[PDB]
Amino acid sequence: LDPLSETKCTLKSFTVEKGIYQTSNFRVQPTESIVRFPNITNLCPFGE
Amino acid sequence: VSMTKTSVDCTMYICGDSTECSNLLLQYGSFCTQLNRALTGIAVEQDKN
Numbered sequence: 001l002d003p004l005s006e007t008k009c010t011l012k013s014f015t016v017e018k019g020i021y022q023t024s025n026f027r028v029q030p031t032e033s034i035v036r037f038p039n040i041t042n043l044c045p046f047g048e
Numbered sequence: 049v050s051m052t053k054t055s056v057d058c059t060m061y062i063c064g065d066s067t068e069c070s071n072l073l074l075q076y077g078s079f080c081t082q083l084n085r086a087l088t089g090i091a092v093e094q095d096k097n
């Protein structure tokens with residue numbers, strides 16, 4: 001919900017004593033996907 | 049008198065950005081939280097010292 005709720009949830013307590021508490025590390029997530037394959041048009045001769 | 053304070057994200061070390069590995073690591077229970085509780089206790093003590 002908010003950073004205090006994440007401390008209550010990490011301490012496993014509905015009350016939090018005075019302090020500084022470490023919590024889930026933040027991390028920026030993907031904006032989009034990329035694929036980069038060598039440009040090849042001809043199919044492989046599996047029939048042969 | 050003291051040593052380097054460290055913190056180690058048990059998820060990013062074990063599973064770095066994989067979700068499949070996170071859902072498997074959850075089957076061990078509290079071991080990641082216990083490791084961070086240990087390294088935080090060492091780190092707070094470097095300032096006490």
Ligand SMILES: *[C@@H]1O[C@H](CO[C@@H]2O[C@@H](C)[C@@H](O)[C@@H](O)[C@@H]2O)[C@@H](O[C@@H]2O[C@H](CO)[C@@H](O)[C@H](O)[C@H]2NC(C)=O)[C@H](O)[C@H]1NC(C)=O
Nearest residue numbers: 033034035036037038039040041042043044045046047048
């Ligand atoms: C191997 O051959 C089968 C079918 O045999 C040939 O089918 C015709 C295309 C013609 O060449 C006949 O003289 C041969 O008997 C191929 O199977 C087909 O595969 C495509 C997809 O690639 C599918 O749309 C068709 O419905 C399939 N038809 C049949 C009958 O199987 C198969 O692709 C061939 N394998 C390779 C590696 O070329």
